[PDB]
Write an enzyme that holds these catalytic residues in place. Structure first.
Site, PDB file in Angstrom:
ATOM      1  N   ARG A  25       0.812  -1.208   0.000  1.00 12.44           N
ATOM      2  CA  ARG A  25       0.000   0.000   0.000  1.00 12.44           C
ATOM      3  C   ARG A  25       0.847   1.260   0.000  1.00 12.44           C
ATOM      4  O   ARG A  25       0.379   2.316  -0.433  1.00 12.44           O
ATOM      5  CB  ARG A  25      -0.933   0.012   1.202  1.00 12.44           C
ATOM      6  CG  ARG A  25      -2.326  -0.465   0.911  1.00 12.44           C
ATOM      7  CD  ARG A  25      -3.116  -0.496   2.191  1.00 12.44           C
ATOM      8  NE  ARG A  25      -4.429  -1.092   2.008  1.00 12.44           N
ATOM      9  CZ  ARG A  25      -4.663  -2.397   1.998  1.00 12.44           C
ATOM     10  NH1 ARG A  25      -3.681  -3.263   2.151  1.00 12.44           N
ATOM     11  NH2 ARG A  25      -5.893  -2.839   1.836  1.00 12.44           N
TER      12      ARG A  25
HETATM   13  N1  ADP Z   1      -6.926   4.759  -8.690  1.00 14.08           N
HETATM   14  C1  ADP Z   1      -5.839   4.005  -8.422  1.00 14.08           C
HETATM   15  N2  ADP Z   1      -4.725   4.097  -9.169  1.00 14.08           N
HETATM   16  C2  ADP Z   1      -3.645   3.348  -8.913  1.00 14.08           C
HETATM   17  N3  ADP Z   1      -3.573   2.459  -7.915  1.00 14.08           N
HETATM   18  C3  ADP Z   1      -4.620   2.269  -7.086  1.00 14.08           C
HETATM   19  C4  ADP Z   1      -5.841   3.048  -7.301  1.00 14.08           C
HETATM   20  N4  ADP Z   1      -6.713   2.671  -6.356  1.00 14.08           N
HETATM   21  C5  ADP Z   1      -6.101   1.729  -5.608  1.00 14.08           C
HETATM   22  N5  ADP Z   1      -4.860   1.487  -6.041  1.00 14.08           N
HETATM   23  C6  ADP Z   1      -3.907   0.529  -5.450  1.00 14.08           C
HETATM   24  O1  ADP Z   1      -4.558  -0.307  -4.496  1.00 14.08           O
HETATM   25  C7  ADP Z   1      -3.839  -0.295  -3.269  1.00 14.08           C
HETATM   26  C8  ADP Z   1      -4.757  -0.432  -2.068  1.00 14.08           C
HETATM   27  O2  ADP Z   1      -5.808   0.520  -2.117  1.00 14.08           O
HETATM   28  P1  ADP Z   1      -6.385   1.149  -0.768  1.00 14.08           P
HETATM   29  O3  ADP Z   1      -6.537   2.616  -0.989  1.00 14.08           O
HETATM   30  O4  ADP Z   1      -5.579   0.646   0.386  1.00 14.08           O
HETATM   31  O5  ADP Z   1      -7.822   0.458  -0.686  1.00 14.08           O
HETATM   32  P2  ADP Z   1      -8.397  -0.182   0.667  1.00 14.08           P
HETATM   33  O6  ADP Z   1      -8.330   0.922   1.693  1.00 14.08           O
HETATM   34  O7  ADP Z   1      -9.767  -0.594   0.230  1.00 14.08           O
HETATM   35  O8  ADP Z   1      -7.540  -1.372   0.981  1.00 14.08           O
HETATM   36  C9  ADP Z   1      -3.133   1.041  -3.242  1.00 14.08           C
HETATM   37  O9  ADP Z   1      -1.889   0.955  -2.559  1.00 14.08           O
HETATM   38  C10 ADP Z   1      -2.901   1.358  -4.691  1.00 14.08           C
HETATM   39  O10 ADP Z   1      -1.590   0.925  -5.037  1.00 14.08           O
END
Ligand code: ADP
Ligand code: ATP
Ligand code: MG
Ligand code: MG
Lengths: 290, 523, 521
Positions: B390
């Protein structure tokens, strides 16, 4: 500076840095300075802790000033070594070794009801070859009585133990009866003298054997270290000793403001003076301003 | 100078005499201070009502705190966990065979604490502090509580420095920053410990090369393992040299269930010393799935009502209390850091379990190791399609940020085409290119057991695999070609990519000139 | 008078009162604790004892510790004095910036507004995200859900929503961080310092957001009530000041999970999968306060975690009935690299009627969904046979749907750190025109990768001609740069002579630092 408990322990000391501090204090006293008060304070535990940590400051330059009789013939250098350690203990404020370890026994066993807790709480001061031999005899009389052998003396449940413990003591090699007769005394001096003159032969045998065991262990450690050292090549030896010396210098140079660090580096500089002074005149030795 | 004295030359030189005097000068004014302020405190007692299964129900102890260490008269310790109106439920830190009905329980007054500090470095302790390696007491150490509140929002800053594990399947594809917690989840005998041991051994290789401020001190918490399994790791950390920087907190399978529940918190407290004083820590909780079984055992024997599979309700709070203590602190608090690697074992690749879905929800990344990838030769058996980070591109090597972006862009294209081409229908000369190139990259990310590759020899190897230099090299010895790509390429080009941290324009033109003067096998 | 702690079992504290028990949902305060411990009364156990949940840790609690009834629920500061601050569940400031100004502090427990004071008005909230604006368009004033497992992009999508709809809109914002990571709460706070939405010190009054944070380190009592505290700040802004509020709730799943973590300690026999018997009513009592009333409006954006990519788990399946627009993010879309990984078929909205968003929007959204659905029906035979039979219209279905699938992806302004790309805001008419172009065969001349991670349909054409210029100019560096270069690449010993050495100490300085801190403090 000394704190007047420092200097009362150094009056009977005879090492160098204690005697110069005593002489500087007395030359301060002669030039119109008063003595400070002696502390009539510091109840018995603090007093014992202070005499423990003040005996060590008399013992530690004295132990380093006693030549070990390593690789010697005859028991007379061992008796020199043991008499020097006796004199150092007497200068540091200890008594005779017999009196002092008997006091340690009686201090560790003021709470003792049974002989089991006697033989278990004085285990750190009696050898294992004697403590196990007394434990098996305590168990042998305990199997007879089927009741705990108590530390009474007048109870003959104790005396059935003690009559075999004396047999164990005479099978170790030490005459128990002349020791008991010495520390029991007598009325007439002519009949106590003939048993003190036997106790002192045992005592000389015992402390000469203890000093000889320590000397033989130091000889074995020196020979082991040398034979592990003569298996290396020379560059390994030089870089090992230079690395250890450099680390031990930096551990005393990172200490700044401590008295032991300044004394350490001053003694390093005094060793370098010794080397330069024998390099100046190698047939005469170091230069001593007499 | 010359002709000192006789009384100056009679002194024995390197006697102690002043370390003894320093101890007696610092000790006696401190112990008169202790004796002049000495009240022997009132000790509140308690009777054991019942005892069994490592739980002792204690009558009395009316002023005991929740989570407070108590002491039985058998010498065995305890912890008051559920305070009830009629009794205290005390989990026993050891064998409960020495506790009887009507035994006396004394409260120690203190919550559970472990010795922290730099004197724990090098040592092998049990679930609470006490060293089990046979090297005496912990000198140069200080006690602190095992249950500390994690740093809040204002106490942090963003995770930007990279944590190099030395495993190139990790350091390229799922990179790890300092202050990031990363789950190593996998099935039964994958490479889970081997990923975590390689992250610890690699910190020894980096600590010799970095300045003193950015050195990472590792803590390995071994929960529920064999005692000879952890004796094989102390032997491995000694003969590598990583034990200079490593603490091992060992709550083995024969320890009591409260000692294995509490050992991740003891190891986190030993590693929070380096976080709180501006240094950097690396904590590895090996089998948090074995800590929760130790927690379930106490919760079911304290008669707390069971939930999913039998687990207590608060088993999410069990692990999120612990993993949130891994943080990158703000520069006001020292800039210190603590990086966590919880290990979770799944059963059949079933990540939908209770404890598995909790820690997946807590940690930032995930290193998912697969048993079917393990036996195909791909070791580390990293599922590159399921493993996340992440923090991502925020805290990886800039020299491999621009190379391993292409690497995951190609391996994503490798995966779906091999699902079709194993049927054997047809192939398309560019679909043929992506399942031939992705086989160059899959063999590139393989690795041996205990050899972490630094960071610059990792990024040169993925450079030579993604800039086409390892095409027309046969797939069987790409694992054997890339020692030549590291040995025959000049050792001073690794220094520039270590010092720049990035492939400069004056370096790719020099490195790709150096990746041509190498003698590759097969060819 | 006051009460006393009778039993501490986990986070659940029994307090015994000798007369005048506190009401249920009344807050009690333990005095003599190290930290401020607030218990909240959950039930009357019956023999003059109440059962409470704690808002902080219960380590250190003693049976018989004195407990003061406050006579009210948990009361938190609300108003303009909270804009730009971070609060606890209990209203304490956790940003280390003074106290909170606290004009008219308010209880965190309320009834849902009524049935008579509802507003039945639907207008679109344009978000810039084209899959959201096209297939499940958000209602300006309604409840939005973001579903998905771990790692699909709920926090990235909610951050893109925050800086796409919150940077300039008519009212205020309230972020309620419920049981999520502290690292991303700090990241959100620092990003809102840099974005000027939260201002520190003397310009604190111009702030447009309140953070209320209840993260994962907190006990289950705090994570169950922090959503109510963010609700109370938004309900003050809606009820008293009558203005539009944005309320972003990261992981409303954690509210249900936190209520489940104390449930069997409250004396409840367990329900389905592991949850409390009162799962639907707890969730409903929270969700029914987030309403546009006749006084103002609260536009809610809630992330919902599904436990194992499982939308049949009762905690997401209960909250599905509360949302006007449910954006479901799928793992399969994320492993393809399509980001935002919004499932186009599974994402629904109540704004997808033709009499609400027009017919030119409705029919292109339904056509895009039909093409993406029969592509999925073909996809089980593409993976086996391989496009050798596909009838020159189903081949066109596969091609158009791959173009649609790439064109739903969009680079986010908050994901510049992640991949590489500057973020794109796409207007509503632009994505309507673009997807109507792709749907009606108008852009079959372009590669399908020109649709991937672009702004609108003119950036597809701006990327297709770039791809052509690039792959037709691969053959530019096959003749040079191997020898006789410009000597802008100097020799290697010159490059390693510029490496200025860092001193390495070989002492580790630890045991001196420890004794330095031991002589300190
Ligand atoms: N719009 C996006 N563009 C690029 N990568 C993304 C995008 N959305 C999510 N990711 C990838 O997914 C990973 C996890 O997303 P996250 O924001 O932690 O979602 P959640 O909180 O649901 O686990 C991020 O570290 C990112 O690398
Ligand atoms: N990268 C690797 N290359 C080759 N072999 C490996 C690698 N990683 C692990 N192994 C082998 O796999 C076996 C299992 O490794 P490991 O001990 O890490 O399993 P684990 O996942 O920790 O499972 P458990 O906790 O049950 O031991 C080890 O014996 C090791 O030899
Ligand atoms: Mg293992
Ligand atoms: Mg999230």
């Amino acid at each position: 500076a000394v704190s007047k408990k420092e200097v009362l322990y150094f009056l009977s000391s005879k090492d160098a840095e204690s005697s110069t501090a005593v002489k500087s204090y007395l030359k301060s006293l002669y030039a119109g300075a008063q003595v400070e008060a002696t502390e009539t304070d510091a109840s018995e535990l603090i007093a014992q802790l202070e005499k423990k940590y003040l005996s060590a400051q008399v013992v530690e330059p004295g132990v380093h000033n006693i030549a070990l009789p390593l690789g010697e013939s005859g028991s007379a250098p061992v008796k020199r070594y043991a008499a020097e350690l006796f004199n150092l203990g007497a200068q540091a404020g200890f008594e005779c070794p017999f009196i002092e370890v008997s006091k340690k026994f009686g201090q560790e066993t003021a709470t003792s009801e049974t002989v089991k807790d006697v033989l278990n709480k004085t285990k750190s001061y009696v050898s294992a070859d004697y403590n196990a031999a007394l434990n098996e005899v305590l168990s042998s009389v305990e199997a007879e009585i089927n009741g705990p052998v108590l530390f009474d003396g007048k109870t003959e449940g104790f005396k059935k133990f003690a009559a075999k413990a004396k047999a164990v003591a005479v099978s170790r090699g030490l005459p128990a009866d002349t020791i008991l007769a010495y520390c029991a005394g007598s009325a007439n001096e002519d009949a106590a003298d003939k048993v003190s003159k036997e106790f002192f032969t045992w005592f000389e045998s015992a402390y000469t054997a203890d000093a000889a065991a320590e000397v033989k262990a130091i000889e074995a450690e020196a020979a082991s270290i040398l034979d592990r050292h003569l298996a290396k090549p020379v560059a390994q030896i030089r870089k090992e000793q230079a690395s250890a010396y450099a680390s031990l210098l930096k551990r005393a140079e990172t200490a700044k403001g401590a008295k032991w660090a300044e004394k350490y580096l001053e003694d390093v500089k005094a060793v370098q003076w010794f080397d330069a002074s024998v390099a100046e005149a190698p047939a005469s030795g170091p230069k001593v301003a007499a | 100078a010359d002709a000192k004295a006789l009384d100056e030359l009679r002194k024995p030189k390197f006697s102690s005499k002043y370390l003894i005097q320093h101890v007696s000068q610092k000790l006696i004014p401190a112990v008169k201070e202790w004796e002049k302020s000495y009240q022997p405190p009132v000790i509140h007692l308690g009777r054991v009502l019942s005892v069994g299964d490592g739980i002792a129900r204690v009558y009395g102890l009316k002023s005991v705190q929740a989570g407070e260490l108590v002491c039985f008269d058998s010498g065995v310790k305890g912890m008051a966990l559920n305070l009830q109106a009629d009794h205290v439920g005390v989990v026993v830190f050891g064998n409960d065979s020495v506790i009887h009905q009507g035994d006396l329980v004394y409260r120690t007054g203190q919550i559970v604490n472990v010795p922290i500090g730099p004197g724990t470095l090098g040592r092998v302790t049990d679930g609470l502090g006490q060293p089990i390696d046979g090297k005496g007491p912990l000198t140069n150490v200080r006690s602190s509580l095992v249950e500390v509140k994690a740093p809040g929002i204002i106490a942090r800053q963003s995770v930007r420095e990279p944590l190099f594990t030395g495993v190139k399947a990790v350091d390229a594809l799922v990179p790890i920053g300092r202050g990031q917690r990363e789950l190593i989840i996998g099935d039964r005998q994958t490479g889970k410990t081997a990923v975590a041991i390689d992250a610890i051994i690699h910190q020894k290789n980096c600590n010799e090369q970095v300045p003193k401020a950015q050195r990472v001190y590792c803590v390995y918490v071994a929960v529920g393992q064999k005692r000879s399994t952890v004796a094989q790791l102390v032997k491995l950390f000694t003969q590598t040299g990583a034990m200079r920087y490593t603490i091992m907190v060992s709550a083995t399978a024969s320890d009591a269930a409260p000692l294995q529940f509490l050992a991740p918190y003891s190891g986190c407290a030993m590693a929070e010393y380096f976080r709180d004083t501006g240094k950097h820590g690396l904590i590895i909780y090996d089998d948090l799935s074995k800590q929760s079984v130790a927690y379930r055992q106490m919760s079911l024997l304290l008669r707390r009502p069971p939930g999913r599979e039998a687990f207590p309700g608060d088993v999410f709070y069990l692990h999120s209390r612990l993993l949130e203590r891994a943080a990158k602190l703000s520069k006001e608090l020292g800039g210190g850091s603590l990086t966590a690697f919880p290990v979770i074992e799944t059963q059949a690749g079933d990540v939908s379990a209770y404890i598995a879905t909790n820690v997946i929800s807590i940690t930032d990344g995930q290193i998912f190791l697969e048993t079917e990838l393990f036996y195909k030769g791909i070791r580390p058996a990293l599922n590159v399609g399921l493993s996340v980070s992440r923090v991502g591109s925020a805290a990886q090597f800039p020299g491999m940020k621009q190379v391993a972006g292409t690497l995951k862009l190609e391996l994503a294209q490798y995966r779906e085409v091999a699902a079709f081409a194993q049927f054997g229908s047809d192939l398309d000369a560019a679909t043929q290119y992506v399942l031939e190139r992705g086989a160059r990259l899959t063999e590139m990310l393989k690795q041996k057991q205990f050899a972490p590759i630094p960071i610059e020899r990792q990024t040169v190897a993925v450079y030579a695999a993604t800039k086409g230099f390892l095409d027309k090299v046969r797939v069987q010895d790409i694992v054997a070609a890339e020692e030549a790509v590291i040995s025959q390429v000049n050792p001073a080009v690794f220094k520039i990519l270590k010092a720049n941290g990035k492939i400069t324009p004056a370096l790719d033109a020099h490195l790709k000139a150096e990746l041509r003067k190498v003698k590759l096998p097969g060819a | 008078d006051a009460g006393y702690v009778s039993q501490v079992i986990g986070p659940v504290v029994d307090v015994r009162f000798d007369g005048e028990l506190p009401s249920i949902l009344s807050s009690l305060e333990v005095e003599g604790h190290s930290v401020r411990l607030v218990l909240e009364v959950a039930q009357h156990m019956g023999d003059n004892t109440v059962r409470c949940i704690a808002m902080d840790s219960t380590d250190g609690l003693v049976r018989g510790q004195k407990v003061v009834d406050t006579g009210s629920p948990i009361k938190v500061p609300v108003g303009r004095g909270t804009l730009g601050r971070i609060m606890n569940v209990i209203g304490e400031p956790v940003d280390e910036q003074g106290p909170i100004d606290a004009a008219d502090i308010w209880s965190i427990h309320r009834e849902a507004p009524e049935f008579t004071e509802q507003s039945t008005e639907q207008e679109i909230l344009v978000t810039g995200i084209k899959v959201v604006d096209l297939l499940a368009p958000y209602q300006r004033g309604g409840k939005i859900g973001l579903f998905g497992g771990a790692g699909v992009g709920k926090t990235v999508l909610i951050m893109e929503l925050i800086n796409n709809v919150a940077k300039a809109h008519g009212g205020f914002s309230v972020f309620a961080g419920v049981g999520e990571r502290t690292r991303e709460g700090n990241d959100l706070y620092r990003e809102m310092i840099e974005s000027g939405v939260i201002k520190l010190g003397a310009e604190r009054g111009n702030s447009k957001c309140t953070l209320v944070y209840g993260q994962m380190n907190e006990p289950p009592g705090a994570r169950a009530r922090v959503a109510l505290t963010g609700l109370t700040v938004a309900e003050y802004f809606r009820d008293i000041e009558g203005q539009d509020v944005l309320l972003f709730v990261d992981n409303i799943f954690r509210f249900t999970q936190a209520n489940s973590e104390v449930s069997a300690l409250l004396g409840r026999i367990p329900s389905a999968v592991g949850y409390q018997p009162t799962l639907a009513t707890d969730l409903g009592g929270l969700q029914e306060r987030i309403t546009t009333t006749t006084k103002g409006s609260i536009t809610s954006v809630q992330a919902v975690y599904v436990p194992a990519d499982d939308l049949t788990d009762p905690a997401p399946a209960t909250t599905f009935a509360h949302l006007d627009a449910t954006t479901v993010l799928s793992r399969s879309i994320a492993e393809l690299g399509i980001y935002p990984a919004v499932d186009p078929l599974d994402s629904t909205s109540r704004m997808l009627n033709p009499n609400v968003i027009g017919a030119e929007h409705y029919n292109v959204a339904r056509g895009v969904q039909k093409v993406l659905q029969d592509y999925k029906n073909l996809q089980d035979i593409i993976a086996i046979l391989g496009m050798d039979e596909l009838s020159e219209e189903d081949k066109l279905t596969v091609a158009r749907a791959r173009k649609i699938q790439r064109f739903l992806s969009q680079p986010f302004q908050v994901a510049e750190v992640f991949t590489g790309t500057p973020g794109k805001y796409v207007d509503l008419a632009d994505t309507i025109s673009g997807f109507q172009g792709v749907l009606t065969g108008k852009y079959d001349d372009l590669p399908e990768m020109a649709f991937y991670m672009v702004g609108d349909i003119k950036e597809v054409k701006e990327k297709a001609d770039k791809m052509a210029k690039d792959i037709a100019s691969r053959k530019e560096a096959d003749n040079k740069k191997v020898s006789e270069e410009l000597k802008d690449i100097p020799s290697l010993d010159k490059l390693v002579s510029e490496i200025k050495e860092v001193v390495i100490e070989e002492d580790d300085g630890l045991e001196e630092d420890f004794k330095a801190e031991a002589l300190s403090s």
